[PDB]
Design an enzyme around this catalytic site. Structure first.
Site, PDB file in Angstrom:
ATOM      1  N   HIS A 279      72.831 115.814 -44.618  1.00  0.00           N
ATOM      2  CA  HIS A 279      72.623 117.101 -45.423  1.00  0.00           C
ATOM      3  C   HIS A 279      71.850 117.994 -44.494  1.00  0.00           C
ATOM      4  O   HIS A 279      71.291 118.995 -45.059  1.00  0.00           O
ATOM      5  CB  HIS A 279      71.775 116.839 -46.773  1.00  0.00           C
ATOM      6  CG  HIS A 279      72.827 115.857 -47.533  1.00  0.00           C
ATOM      7  ND1 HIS A 279      74.013 116.135 -48.115  1.00  0.00           N
ATOM      8  CD2 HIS A 279      72.220 114.664 -48.143  1.00  0.00           C
ATOM      9  CE1 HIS A 279      74.451 115.142 -48.505  1.00  0.00           C
ATOM     10  NE2 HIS A 279      73.405 114.173 -48.846  1.00  0.00           N
TER      11      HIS A 279
ATOM     12  N   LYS B  23      72.836 104.106 -53.022  1.00  0.00           N
ATOM     13  CA  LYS B  23      72.281 104.514 -54.050  1.00  0.00           C
ATOM     14  C   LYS B  23      73.432 104.386 -55.165  1.00  0.00           C
ATOM     15  O   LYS B  23      73.084 103.879 -56.419  1.00  0.00           O
ATOM     16  CB  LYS B  23      71.888 105.865 -54.026  1.00  0.00           C
ATOM     17  CG  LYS B  23      72.665 107.042 -53.639  1.00  0.00           C
ATOM     18  CD  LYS B  23      72.074 108.447 -53.616  1.00  0.00           C
ATOM     19  CE  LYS B  23      72.934 109.297 -53.265  1.00  0.00           C
ATOM     20  NZ  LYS B  23      72.993 109.418 -51.564  1.00  0.00           N
TER      21      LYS B  23
ATOM     22  N   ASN C 127      74.443 111.656 -59.690  1.00  0.00           N
ATOM     23  CA  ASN C 127      75.333 112.049 -58.663  1.00  0.00           C
ATOM     24  C   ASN C 127      76.441 111.095 -58.423  1.00  0.00           C
ATOM     25  O   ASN C 127      77.583 111.444 -57.727  1.00  0.00           O
ATOM     26  CB  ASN C 127      74.422 112.075 -57.486  1.00  0.00           C
ATOM     27  CG  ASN C 127      75.057 112.575 -56.156  1.00  0.00           C
ATOM     28  OD1 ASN C 127      75.499 113.764 -55.900  1.00  0.00           O
ATOM     29  ND2 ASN C 127      75.237 111.472 -55.494  1.00  0.00           N
TER      30      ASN C 127
HETATM   31  C1  LIG Z   1      77.745 119.128 -54.200  1.00  0.00           C
HETATM   32  C2  LIG Z   1      77.222 118.285 -55.120  1.00  0.00           C
HETATM   33  O1  LIG Z   1      75.763 117.781 -55.521  1.00  0.00           O
HETATM   34  N1  LIG Z   1      78.172 117.622 -56.288  1.00  0.00           N
HETATM   35  C3  LIG Z   1      77.592 116.888 -57.284  1.00  0.00           C
HETATM   36  C4  LIG Z   1      77.859 117.739 -58.488  1.00  0.00           C
HETATM   37  O2  LIG Z   1      79.344 117.966 -58.767  1.00  0.00           O
HETATM   38  P1  LIG Z   1      79.703 119.671 -59.056  1.00  0.00           P
HETATM   39  O3  LIG Z   1      81.246 119.352 -59.232  1.00  0.00           O
HETATM   40  O4  LIG Z   1      78.962 119.885 -60.315  1.00  0.00           O
HETATM   41  O5  LIG Z   1      79.261 120.219 -57.888  1.00  0.00           O
HETATM   42  P2  LIG Z   1      78.900 121.798 -57.417  1.00  0.00           P
HETATM   43  O6  LIG Z   1      77.472 122.109 -57.402  1.00  0.00           O
HETATM   44  O7  LIG Z   1      79.801 122.721 -58.439  1.00  0.00           O
HETATM   45  O8  LIG Z   1      79.259 122.051 -56.184  1.00  0.00           O
HETATM   46  C5  LIG Z   1      80.485 121.598 -55.603  1.00  0.00           C
HETATM   47  C6  LIG Z   1      80.724 122.301 -54.484  1.00  0.00           C
HETATM   48  O9  LIG Z   1      80.892 123.560 -54.651  1.00  0.00           O
HETATM   49  C7  LIG Z   1      80.143 124.355 -53.708  1.00  0.00           C
HETATM   50  N2  LIG Z   1      79.581 125.439 -54.506  1.00  0.00           N
HETATM   51  C8  LIG Z   1      79.059 125.377 -55.688  1.00  0.00           C
HETATM   52  C9  LIG Z   1      78.426 126.343 -56.458  1.00  0.00           C
HETATM   53  C10 LIG Z   1      78.454 127.650 -55.873  1.00  0.00           C
HETATM   54  O10 LIG Z   1      78.151 128.657 -56.717  1.00  0.00           O
HETATM   55  N3  LIG Z   1      79.182 127.973 -54.613  1.00  0.00           N
HETATM   56  C11 LIG Z   1      79.606 126.801 -54.085  1.00  0.00           C
HETATM   57  O11 LIG Z   1      80.215 127.131 -52.830  1.00  0.00           O
HETATM   58  C12 LIG Z   1      79.109 123.369 -53.171  1.00  0.00           C
HETATM   59  O12 LIG Z   1      78.437 123.995 -51.872  1.00  0.00           O
HETATM   60  C13 LIG Z   1      79.815 122.262 -52.999  1.00  0.00           C
HETATM   61  O13 LIG Z   1      80.404 122.243 -51.735  1.00  0.00           O
HETATM   62  O14 LIG Z   1      77.653 117.001 -59.613  1.00  0.00           O
HETATM   63  C14 LIG Z   1      78.208 115.628 -60.075  1.00  0.00           C
HETATM   64  C15 LIG Z   1      77.402 115.269 -61.307  1.00  0.00           C
HETATM   65  O15 LIG Z   1      76.181 115.081 -60.924  1.00  0.00           O
HETATM   66  C16 LIG Z   1      78.187 114.800 -58.807  1.00  0.00           C
HETATM   67  O16 LIG Z   1      78.654 113.665 -59.014  1.00  0.00           O
HETATM   68  C17 LIG Z   1      78.314 115.647 -57.608  1.00  0.00           C
HETATM   69  O17 LIG Z   1      78.514 114.597 -56.383  1.00  0.00           O
HETATM   70  C18 LIG Z   1      79.079 114.772 -54.937  1.00  0.00           C
HETATM   71  C19 LIG Z   1      79.908 113.308 -55.069  1.00  0.00           C
HETATM   72  C20 LIG Z   1      78.615 115.567 -54.029  1.00  0.00           C
HETATM   73  O18 LIG Z   1      79.130 116.226 -53.422  1.00  0.00           O
HETATM   74  N4  LIG Z   1      77.143 115.196 -53.810  1.00  0.00           N
HETATM   75  C21 LIG Z   1      76.294 115.671 -52.939  1.00  0.00           C
HETATM   76  C22 LIG Z   1      74.869 115.164 -52.629  1.00  0.00           C
HETATM   77  C23 LIG Z   1      77.076 115.615 -51.555  1.00  0.00           C
HETATM   78  O19 LIG Z   1      76.911 116.383 -50.599  1.00  0.00           O
HETATM   79  N5  LIG Z   1      77.866 114.802 -51.221  1.00  0.00           N
HETATM   80  C24 LIG Z   1      78.765 114.817 -50.264  1.00  0.00           C
HETATM   81  C25 LIG Z   1      80.057 114.180 -50.380  1.00  0.00           C
HETATM   82  C26 LIG Z   1      81.202 114.512 -49.302  1.00  0.00           C
HETATM   83  C27 LIG Z   1      82.428 113.998 -49.902  1.00  0.00           C
HETATM   84  O20 LIG Z   1      82.776 113.821 -51.175  1.00  0.00           O
HETATM   85  O21 LIG Z   1      83.347 113.835 -48.933  1.00  0.00           O
HETATM   86  C28 LIG Z   1      78.231 114.279 -48.835  1.00  0.00           C
HETATM   87  O22 LIG Z   1      77.998 114.941 -47.985  1.00  0.00           O
HETATM   88  O23 LIG Z   1      77.661 113.099 -48.846  1.00  0.00           O
END
Ligand SMILES: CC(=O)N[C@H]1[C@@H](OP(=O)(O)OP(=O)(O)OC[C@H]2O[C@@H](n3ccc(=O)[nH]c3=O)[C@H](O)[C@@H]2O)O[C@H](CO)[C@@H](O)[C@@H]1O[C@H](C)C(=O)N[C@@H](C)C(=O)N[C@H](CCC(=O)O)C(=O)O
Length: 429
Positions: free
Chosen positions: A183, A115, A138
């Site tokens: 996931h 993607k 993302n």
């Molecule tokens: C988790 C998520 O969806 N992240 C996307 C998001 O970033 P962000 O900085 O706003 O993320 P966030 O919602 O604050 O969460 C970040 C982390 O804090 C944690 N969190 C968040 C909020 C809360 O209250 N509690 C908490 O613990 C989440 O579980 C997560 O672990 O918004 C950005 C802009 O849209 C994205 O680029 C980013 O994508 C990343 C790369 C990602 O993590 N995406 C998801 C789909 C995912 O799980 N990807 C992982 C990557 C693992 C790795 O980097 O090794 C995967 O498993 O493939």
């Protein structure tokens, strides 16, 4: 929409949450923001005027809200959030807010693998046509930061998480590239729940682009791409074809690998549906070199390639690296991290023979070493694994970081994992 005078609560002080805080402040609405992390990363960057709550979700704030804006990193199934939903409190994500505001067509791309490559390609195709294009989601740049009155096309990479909270997306062209187990930590109803999240991308899409070789990409009619089947398909040298007509000999592409050729077909299908000229779209295919951390050669020295595929965070992605991989000597394969409850078994069939060594680490290291114990070493960290394998590396070997896991048990993100690998490769190689 109009948010004037609404009690707005944002969950998440990461990249998304900070962009939402700004979005609302620019519109004369002061949101409140919470995060379950005790010391979330964006705390320092949060404006002083904005109330914030850390260490937990605040139910007093949630149940008082008119609108909850949930970052993709918090599950909708979280008891506090399900309580709010049961009370009829509207819950959206940033991609929802973006769709309500966007004033140019949106190409939307999801899938378990490919993607970011397809999103970037479609962006390159738009640039080649001289179109003012905003690329984000993302892939890393929060979508609300794209909003621009001069923008003529938006290309969004969307996760299944982002899609769960999105209801207003009406893409000019939308695709699910593929669906493979990922996931599962967020989807207690398994593969079909995960799939259901991705299928939202097709709702009210003008053109839906499906993978003819992956039935889970199909809604239940769509333009298709595939290897031997599809409106867009391959003709084996390999050619990209659109309904029987040769359009590009892939020797003109910088990318290689069959999965990247189907990624190119997907991109071309989306670019065609979005109305971009095919000529300039094909040009972009010939110039695009790839992405950091995506099967990226970071060192080739002494007859050894060291390849950073840190972006391989699920089993399907690591399969794409291994399937058909040619290695002259021994493959030294680094696996590990947080496997998100995935079944690693599908990898086993690539790990036979005298010329594969496994170096497994992180949270699920033992489970990965168990794929083939006799050729496996387990360490705690990736650095320990690298220093372990490096002495054993001979001319003709390959060292491949394609870990099939998230990095988040030990690293900030997969980019940090890839950067550390590249540093260590340059030290040890
Ligand atoms: C988790 C998520 O969806 N992240 C996307 C998001 O970033 P962000 O900085 O706003 O993320 P966030 O919602 O604050 O969460 C970040 C982390 O804090 C944690 N969190 C968040 C909020 C809360 O209250 N509690 C908490 O613990 C989440 O579980 C997560 O672990 O918004 C950005 C802009 O849209 C994205 O680029 C980013 O994508 C990343 C790369 C990602 O993590 N995406 C998801 C789909 C995912 O799980 N990807 C992982 C990557 C693992 C790795 O980097 O090794 C995967 O498993 O493939």
């Amino acid at each position: 929409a109009d948010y004037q005078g609404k009690n707005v609560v944002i969950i998440g002080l990461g990249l998304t949450g900070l962009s939402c805080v700004d979005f609302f402040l620019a519109r004369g609405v002061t949101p409140r923001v919470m995060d379950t992390r005790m010391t979330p990363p964006g705390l320092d960057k949060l404006p002083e005027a904005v109330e914030r709550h850390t260490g937990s979700l605040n139910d007093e704030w949630l149940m008082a809200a008119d609108l909850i804006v949930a970052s993709p990193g918090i599950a909708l199934a979280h008891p506090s959030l399900s309580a709010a939903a049961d009370a009829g409190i509207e819950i959206v994500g940033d991609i929802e807010l973006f769709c309500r505001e966007a004033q140019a067509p949106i190409v939307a791309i999801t899938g378990s693998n490919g993607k970011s490559t397809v999103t970037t390609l479609v962006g390159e195709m738009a640039k080649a046509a001289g179109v003012n294009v905003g690329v984000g989601g993302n892939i890393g740049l929060p979508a609300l930061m794209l909003l621009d009155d001069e923008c003529e096309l938006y290309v969004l990479e969307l996760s299944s998480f982002q899609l769960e909270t999105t209801s207003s997306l009406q893409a000019v062209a939308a695709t699910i590239l593929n669906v493979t187990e990922d996931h599962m930590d967020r989807y207690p109803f398994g593969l079909q729940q995960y799939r259901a999240a991705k299928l939202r991308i097709y709702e009210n899409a003008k053109v839906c682009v499906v993978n003819a070789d992956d039935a889970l990409t199909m809604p239940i009619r769509c333009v298709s791409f595939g290897v031997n089947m599809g409106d867009y398909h391959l003709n084996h040298e390999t050619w990209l074809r659109v309904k029987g007509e040769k359009v590009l000999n892939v020797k003109e592409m910088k990318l290689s690998g069959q999965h990247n050729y189907t990624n190119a077909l997907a991109a071309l299908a989306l670019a065609d549906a979005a109305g971009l000229p095919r000529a300039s779209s094909l040009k972009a295919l010939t110039t695009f070199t790839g992405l950091p951390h995506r099967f990226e050669v970071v060192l080739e020295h002494n007859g050894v390639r060291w390849i950073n595929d840190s972006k391989a965070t699920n089993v399907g992605s690591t399969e794409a690296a291994l399937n058909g991989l040619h290695v002259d000597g021994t493959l030294h394969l680094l696996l590990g991290g947080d496997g998100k409850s995935a079944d690693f078994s599908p990898l086993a069939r690539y790990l036979n023979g005298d010329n594969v060594r496994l170096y497994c680490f992180g949270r699920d290291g033992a489970q990965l070493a168990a794929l083939r114990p006799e050729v496996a070493e387990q360490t705690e960290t990736m650095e320990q694994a690298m220093r372990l394998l490096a002495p054993r590396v001979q001319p003709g070997d390959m060292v491949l970081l394609s870990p099939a896991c998230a990095s988040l048990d030990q690293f900030k993100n997969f980019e940090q994992r890839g950067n550390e690998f590249a540093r260590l490769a340059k030290e040890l190689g």
